[PDB]
Design a protein around this ligand. Sequence first.
Ligand SMILES: Nc1ncnc2c1ncn2[C@@H]1O[C@H](COP(=O)(O)OP(=O)(O)OP(=O)(O)O)[C@@H](O)[C@H]1O
Ligand SMILES: Nc1ncnc2c1ncn2[C@@H]1O[C@H](COP(=O)(O)OP(=O)(O)O)[C@@H](O)[C@H]1O
Ligand SMILES: Nc1ncnc2c1ncn2[C@@H]1O[C@H](COP(=O)(O)OP(=O)(O)O)[C@@H](O)[C@H]1O
Ligand SMILES: [Mg+2]
Ligand SMILES: [Mg+2]
Ligand SMILES: [Mg+2]
Lengths: 362, 185, 151, 168, 387, 173, 399
Amino acid sequence: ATSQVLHILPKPSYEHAFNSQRTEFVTTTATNQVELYEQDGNGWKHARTFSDHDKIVTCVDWAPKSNRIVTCSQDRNAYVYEKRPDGTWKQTLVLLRLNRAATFVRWSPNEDKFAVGSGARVISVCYFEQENDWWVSKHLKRPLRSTILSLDWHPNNVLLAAGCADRKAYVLSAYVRDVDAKPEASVWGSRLPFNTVCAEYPSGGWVHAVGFSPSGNALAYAGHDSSVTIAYPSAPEQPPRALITVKLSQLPLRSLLWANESAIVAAGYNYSPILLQGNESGWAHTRDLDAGTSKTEGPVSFTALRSTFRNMDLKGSSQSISSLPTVHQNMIATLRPYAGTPGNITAFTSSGTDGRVVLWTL
Amino acid sequence: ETTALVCDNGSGLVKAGFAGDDAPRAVFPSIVGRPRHQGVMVGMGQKDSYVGDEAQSKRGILTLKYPIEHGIITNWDDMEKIWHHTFYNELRVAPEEHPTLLTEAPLNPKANREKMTQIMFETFNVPAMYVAIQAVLSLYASGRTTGIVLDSGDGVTHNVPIYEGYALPHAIMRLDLAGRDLTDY
Amino acid sequence: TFRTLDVDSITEPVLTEQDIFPIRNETAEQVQAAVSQLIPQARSAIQTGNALQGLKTLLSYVPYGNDVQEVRTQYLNAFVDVLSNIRAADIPAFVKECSTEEIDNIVNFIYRGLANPQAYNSSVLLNWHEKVVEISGIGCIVRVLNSRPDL
Amino acid sequence: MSNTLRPYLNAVRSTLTASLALEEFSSEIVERQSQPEVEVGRSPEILLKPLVVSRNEQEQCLIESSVNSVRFSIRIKQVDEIERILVRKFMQFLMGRAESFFILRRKPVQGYDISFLITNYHTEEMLKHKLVDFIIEFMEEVDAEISEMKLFLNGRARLVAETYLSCF
Amino acid sequence: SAPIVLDNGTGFVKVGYAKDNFPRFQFPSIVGRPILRAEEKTGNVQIKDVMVGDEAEAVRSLLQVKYPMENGIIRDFEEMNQLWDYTFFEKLKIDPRGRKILLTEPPMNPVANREKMCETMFERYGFGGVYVAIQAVLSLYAQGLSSGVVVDSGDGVTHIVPVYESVVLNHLVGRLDVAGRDATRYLISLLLRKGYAFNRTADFETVREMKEKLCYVSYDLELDHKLSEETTVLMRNYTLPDGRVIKVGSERYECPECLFQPHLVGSEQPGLSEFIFDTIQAADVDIRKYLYRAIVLSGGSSMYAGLPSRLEKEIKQLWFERVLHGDPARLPNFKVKIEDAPRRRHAVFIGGAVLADIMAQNDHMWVSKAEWEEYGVRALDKLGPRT
Amino acid sequence: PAYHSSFLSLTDVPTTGNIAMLPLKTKFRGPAYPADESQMDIIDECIGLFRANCFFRNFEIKGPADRTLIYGTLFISECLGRVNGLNYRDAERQLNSLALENFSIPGSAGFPLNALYAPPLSPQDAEIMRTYLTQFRQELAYRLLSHVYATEKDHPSKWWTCFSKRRFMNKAL
Amino acid sequence: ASFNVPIIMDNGTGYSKLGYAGNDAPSYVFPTVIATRSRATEDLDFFIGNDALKKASAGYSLDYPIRHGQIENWDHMERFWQQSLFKYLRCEPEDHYFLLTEPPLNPPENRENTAEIMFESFNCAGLYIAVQAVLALAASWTSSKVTDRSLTGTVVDSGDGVTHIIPVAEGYVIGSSIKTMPLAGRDVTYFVQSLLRDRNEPDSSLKTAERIKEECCYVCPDIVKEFSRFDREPDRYLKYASESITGHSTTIDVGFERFLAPEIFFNPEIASSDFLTPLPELVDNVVQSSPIDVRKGLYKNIVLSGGSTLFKNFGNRLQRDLKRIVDERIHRSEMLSGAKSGGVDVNVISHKRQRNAVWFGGSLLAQTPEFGSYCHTKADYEEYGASIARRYQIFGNSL
Ligand SMILES: Nc1ncnc2c1ncn2[C@@H]1O[C@H](COP(=O)(O)OP(=O)(O)OP(=O)(O)O)[C@@H](O)[C@H]1O
Ligand SMILES: Nc1ncnc2c1ncn2[C@@H]1O[C@H](COP(=O)(O)OP(=O)(O)O)[C@@H](O)[C@H]1O
Ligand SMILES: Nc1ncnc2c1ncn2[C@@H]1O[C@H](COP(=O)(O)OP(=O)(O)O)[C@@H](O)[C@H]1O
Ligand SMILES: [Mg+2]
Ligand SMILES: [Mg+2]
Ligand SMILES: [Mg+2]
């Protein structure tokens, strides 16, 4: 493949999100600030910041249809941002009623409701009441046991894949009346009342991420044991047809994105993304998209010479510092789509603790 | 990080600037020239002495005289005036806010260096200062560790051979012939 | 006074290890008998100069649990002896001719053997660890970090 | 040093680089707060099993990991009690300046003499592919220092004995 | 049009109107006189005779700051008059005569302060209405609750008041003389431990922002002493607005500890949790659940990180130690729920805004100008006959 | 640091910008209203208090009279820095020449204390301020010269010129 | 059984005063400075005290281990202690009990380092750490026979590096009222040196400034009136004979410094902007922050301490200022209320042992039989570790 480094953030970024037109993107940093960036010719430049929160901002997600930004942070509060006609953005607090720090947020594919993961044993799902202009949260506390580490919606807009930190993968129905209509019968189930245990699957570690297939009839989750498991549901209260597990020889995976109806791209502490080709019969690692082991008479400038003396003085080597082969320098955060019709993705972006926002061109 | 003034009061020019700058931002001749005419004209606030570029520009009716002679200071009052000019009218930084870094030729008289540090501490109230050697700094700028450095400024020409780290103090040869003598010839 | 005497330990019962990992369906007597049957086969295989086959047979079943300490210690002693009775030059073929789960058990038990050096030989365990990490990769150690505490 | 500590040193290297897959995680019992989870040990569902690396009975490497923090304590050889006193004093001086080290504990865990503690932030900002390099480098250089300092003790004792005795 | 509401807190000033949700303007209650010291004193725009509010806190480098209000009461009143003038004349720039204002006041203030504040508001402004309400009832209004005990901790003084089913127990109102200012002073002392000295006036606001950004409330004392005794993870780096960085260690968890252990600042009064427990226990046996079941934090000083959890754990522990006498049999039969709404800092303002239109459209509920002038100071009894 | 002009308590005193038109006694020409000959005027008290004010490093202003006192202190520092090592007649010549020089005024770019001193309201106010400052510093220099040579004639007393290097408030004309 | 006499250490910023318990005077009062180079190895070529002072230009570079009361470099401190013990004090550490002193408001890390150095490098039988003040209160009372102990007052300990105002009530020290100004004899010495600098005197050595204080400086009521008096009175213009090294009869013409230097205590703005509260006002704040019942005792007995309080008219001026401020407050209350009162008196007390009150108090305290039980025994250190003395006790409450 081929990758282009979009920007070099000065600080680690655990999340990013692009607008529908892919014109400007929002990203988080280490502190309570949330950063905005816009294109400057061939590069990107700073746009504005948000200091509404008080503690470390955890996750940020952009709604492409309505062009809205939500932000859930460690301060147990959620802010929803909508741009004003003049150009500025209007903040709006959402009362999550949580007891611990939020961890992960996602917009529904219809963007009517958004679910919030949390370490307070619960998950908060919020919608908008036009009659009161209010956001109200509902707690999902029946089967949950540990911290929420990831979220994943379903194309039916009702099922919600929750990646818990109790070595068990969770799927729940987030259907709510007055917002969503009745959903069609699904392989996951048909009778879907609010807060019902759709499915439960085990793992060999904390479920860092979960993901439904583009067809919507599967789940893929990765534990902390560097193993990605692809689930194929059969019927309600019926064991899945096949639980394919692929075990790797690298660092544990972090986030999972579905390249197409039969391909999964996932990246973690290995500083690189991977690809999975297969079907119901099985799966296997296909290729290392990060070039693998690439290992990538003249005057000396004043800055270089000063650097050489500083390294010599503070050090005993005065040699090149890292020269790390992989494009990223630290653990990767997440993978999100960039362009293409559903089930047809060729470009997807990624962010990491090094601050690099590296687009990946399949 | 810890910016410090770097004043190299050479015998012909006074190159100055902050630490870490790519090139010095304050270069001007080390000349103090008083007028030598009656000056019946009144007004315009005619000063009693001009230093540096102003002296060079007004040299038509000024008695220019260098305050240093072959690296050795001989006009301490004039040199104090030049230092005041460098600190205030050219760099525009308070002396008591940044440390300074001076240079002097090898084998110079000890009283010269003693009075240099005495003035820069008692008068300008600088926090700290150091008196390096021109050859060592030239070795720094050359990006090497060994070699014999031939330094020849306006005042004096001197060679300080330096091996890896260590500098031999018995092989320092100093010759007074320099740019001023060449100009006189 | 009232600052001490913590109460948070009783009002909210924290999650305990059996809530995380699946419980052992087998009984204590059953696993004890299984190990007591497997070990002498391994010792006999060591005696007849077929240590690779003995280790393969001993690797088929692996016991665990918080009530099987003694039998687990005997199993570990037998495993350590079997592994130390293997020529070094034949290790890479053995490592390459294993499944991922078998290699996971091997690395787990050699690493537990490393924890008690006052009764074992650390050199052979370190050499095996080096070779398995070189061949299989780091995922084995990852699985070790994410294995059951009773293993 | 090396040519001598290959298997033990590489085992420590591999275990440490595998155990450094940290992550930002808040506190599950206190809100709007984040603490190193290895040191508190209140939520067992995020604490990986303790791991030990050894080469001989007097050398151990306790590796305790967690979701965000990793504590790594080692024992170094003390063949004779001279080396015992030297090691204790030297490692005390080493931990006395943990402010400028960022990966040290001011007091080691009991039964040991040093305990590193790599919280998330160190992996967040400081590139961590040479933290392990520093670890192994120290684990060999420390024995080097102990030997050299006992040589220096012998030398100074000889010098003072000669100085005292020559002035009769 | 709509009545105005004013919350003249000790460390901050908030103002707005009825039906509002968030404070329209907030700014420190500071007065800046010009001063020249050993600084650079860039002439940014100009220095006026008396600079107050946002301009004062922005140009604070070149001016000295005096706090008109201390311990919840006004010390010097001319500066506070300048403060009302600023707030009414440029913060809102609407200064009609005859509008209705709803003031605020902590419970056990001296009578003279409130009386002469009302006198100033009448004579110097000519407003046609006035009402002074306790911050606690406004905090109760903020969440719409009716029964329960609410604790308000601010910059000046921390007070707690129990209310059961629309009845304020005036004989059990609390007053703890430890607040954010004492915490800031203890932080300054704890920094003087290491060597840093903050004796200027702007340094007070600097260390206030430092405590805002870094300090946190401990949840387990011994655990944090162990952390600060063996590990260097607690060290934070803070850069002053002047540009200088300092090292902060155990000060982070030792600064707000004075709220729970007032003996650190030389206060004989019991800690926050102990005082809450005594206040709840002194009440009648019937309302004790609803006192325990609904405890609402309010005020800026309650925004300490990890404060609600420590408060709940400590109140449960103290109940266990004081009532059960060590018997753990009946511990799981206790229900305590501390409220931690995100805007508990502006709960007083929200309650005032609600009460502004709760009792509007009927002037015969509060005091008017004519009634004031013809019944003297004693006219100020229609508000409430509190003890 | 509490030392301040005794005329800050004056009432109905005229002013220009934010600088008081305090009375002054002088043989020069200017707008200052002559003061009583038996009193302790602004210039005399400023000269007397300079030797103690130049050592402080924290001054809080209470009114325009304090601004006048600060201006006087700045001029005294400048003169002490200039009068060093001269004669008597030469001292008066040099000080009069420097005082009559077209200096910087509040409201102009070159004024170092533009933050504290307000610009003049009207051009007439600007001109009256011009003449006030000229007269004030002329008389201040005259009084300083009278005081500093109170014992000899051919040399300034080193006790009174040892304050020349003292840089009062680090901000001066 | 019969133990050996305890040893009273003292490590001030400028001077260190060793000695023994029961003695009527310190055995050694020499500056806290160590000479050091940069066929004896460089490990041992170090001199301390007066020997270091004399051997200054012979090839050594002096350095002061203690500044502002807190020790920065540890090699210098440990070498200073070993040189003292094994050269001047002449004692075997393992058979004696030590009474170290160190200024309050120190980091616990410094105390931990001091304890571990003492119990490892030397490993004495026992080590006790006391606060520079306390001993001052102990030495305050002269005819201490059985009963006449004040046990309640204020100690204004002003020394070379830092000054401390510590109130004591019925023995116990009220921590919450402790406040410290970071100005002392050294800062005013630098001020005197700068004053000599501006007048371009022929000699401006720091020792010359110290001697100029020793026989010249005195406190004055106010600065402008003193300047006027100096202008009028011409016999206040002294010329101190210097004789630095070879400048025979190079008299230094002293001037306004004689009253400008001591005024820093009652006007701290001159020294620096780090502090701006005058000493009497700061003492007033300290007394007011104290509990109400002990204010009379705090005001009644004020004890001076340290070598920097020996200025003439220092106590008189301090008492005058404090009395004026307390009268102002009391009268303000009176006209607010409208009733007379008996008022409160102030008696600033100076005694015959002003210079070394801390040492004398330590010596008087160590002789008590109960002192031995309070020391840190070596068994306690070897059992509980090197952090046995880290819990800071006098100022502030732990946990
Ligand atoms: N997140 C936070 N962490 C720590 N302290 C905080 C935080 N937020 C606010 N504070 C403190 O709260 C104070 C502001 O409180 P506020 O001004 O609302 O009380 P107040 O209205 O003055 O009280 P009163 O009505 O009794 O006068 C500030 O001094 C600040 O120190
Ligand atoms: N390009 C040049 N060609 C010839 N002579 C030069 C040139 N540049 C400088 N010089 C001579 O060098 C002298 C300046 O030397 P300088 O670098 O100031 O030495 P220093 O700093 O030690 O005084 C001048 O007198 C000038 O005559
Ligand atoms: N007679 C004196 N008058 C004023 N200051 C003095 C006098 N003698 C000494 N000093 C200064 O006061 C300091 C206080 O003395 P001392 O208490 O021994 O010092 P330290 O505070 O370092 O323990 C001395 O170091 C010295 O700088
Ligand atoms: Mg040169
Ligand atoms: Mg309030
Ligand atoms: Mg002292």
